[PDB]
Every structure is written in structure tokens, then in C-alpha cells.
């Protein structure tokens, strides 16, 4: 329904992918591109384009994303050292797919939140 | 674990100015702001760390993120984008030990990860 991005294929198994974790709510896969040793995202089973269309019957489907990503983040080895979590949204934010993404990325000291400040 | 100072802004213990509070999460202004829209949204229970939370608090955490989408809107950030950032731990860069997600917008907030050596 509506849109799709190519994460609509990903999640339901359409296109090659390496999926870590899936439910009812959430889909979780590998970057192509990673930029951290660990470098996965955790995406809504349901069409979002961006965050500014969640409405409060994602919440649960929301709320499981960070629940999944301490669970990765555990089975990665990443957990006591840590790791930070990031959605990215429209231009300032420089998002590319759009369909609502969480990154989860660690393995490494991961610097400052942002260029310079 | 010990409840930050979070806990003080969000029950109301200490002067503040807060933009969003509802009975699951609390948003307010950083004290050191890194873009224009620099705002922390924070569940009211106190969660340290991202490794703490589990089911019961899922709805809170949805809740993180349809603030984040309020008070997007109402900065005038919504179009041009924002980030929502959450910190764990060292690597993380993690401070205060309840958790909360930085809503940053308002310029081009350039490299996702910048620093990706030393
Ligand atoms: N596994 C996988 N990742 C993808 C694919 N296409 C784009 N990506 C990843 O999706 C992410 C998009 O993040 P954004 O810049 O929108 O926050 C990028 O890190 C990019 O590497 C794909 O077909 N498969
Ligand atoms: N408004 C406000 N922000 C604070 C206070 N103490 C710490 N902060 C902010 O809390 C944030 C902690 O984020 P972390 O580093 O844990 O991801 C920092 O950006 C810091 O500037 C405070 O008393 N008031």
C-alpha cells in the first residue's frame, strides 16, 4: 500500500537481505554500507515514510524498534561497551529511503553526535 | 540504579521550562545545544540505559517518537528534517544515565557518524 521503498521488498523477503531479527512489528538487517563494525537498521514492518507521518497507533511497532536494538546490540557484543542509535529524517537529516529507519551502530568509540558541535 | 536529574525536571522539583509532558515521557531544551532544535525527550520511569528497558516500556519509547514528530513540527523543522539520537554507554558517548533521545534540527547536521577514526 502506497509508496514503497525497497526496504517494503526486504522485509517481506523479496529481495536478498541479512535479516537479523523479524516479528509482527519490526524487521531488522544488516547495512549494505556499514559505517560501524556493527551497523544494523531496525525498520516498522508498515509503510512510514518519514516521522512525521507516525501516528499513535505505531507506538507499539515504534517502541519494539529500541526494544530489538538492545537485543541486537547484546547479541553483538556491543552492549557493555556501547553503542548509539540514530533516525535520520528529509534533508537536514539526510535521509535517503524513506521509509522510518532506526540505526544501530557500535563496536568502535563512536566520536561526537555531530560534526563540530 | 540512582535517578539523575531528569527525574528533579520532570516531576516538577526544580524550576524548568518544559515543552511536552504527558503521563509517559517529558521533553525540555538542552543546556549546551548543538543545532538550533536541540531538545531532550525522555520517558518519565527511570530507565538508565537502553540495555534496561523491556516490553512494559514500549509504549513509552513509541511515545519518544511521536513527540519527537509534535515538536518537530512545532520548531518548523519537520521539512527540512532532523536527527533523533540516543546515546549508550561509553562508546555511545552516553552522560546522564537516563535514558532519552536528542531531537537535533534546524540546519544541515552534516555526517551521520563524523568521527569514524580516532
Ligand atoms: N541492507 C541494505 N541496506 C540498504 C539498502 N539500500 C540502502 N541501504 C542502507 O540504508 C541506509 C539508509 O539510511 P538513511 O540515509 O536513509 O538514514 C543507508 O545506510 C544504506 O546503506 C539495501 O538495499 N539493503
Ligand atoms: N536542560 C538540561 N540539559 C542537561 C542538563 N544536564 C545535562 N544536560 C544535557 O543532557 C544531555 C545528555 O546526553 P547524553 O550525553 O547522555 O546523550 C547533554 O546534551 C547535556 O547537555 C540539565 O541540567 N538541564
Redo the contacts with the bound molecule.
Sequence with gaps: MAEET??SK?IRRE?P??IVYQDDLVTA?????P?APT?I?IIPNILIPTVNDVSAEHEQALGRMITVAAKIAEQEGIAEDGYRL???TNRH?????YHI?M?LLGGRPLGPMLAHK
Design positions: 525497497i526496504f526486504i529481495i537481505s541479512d538487517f544488516r547495512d549494505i554500507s559505517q551497523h537498521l540514530i533516525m535520520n537529516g539526510g535521509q535517503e529511503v529507519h540505526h
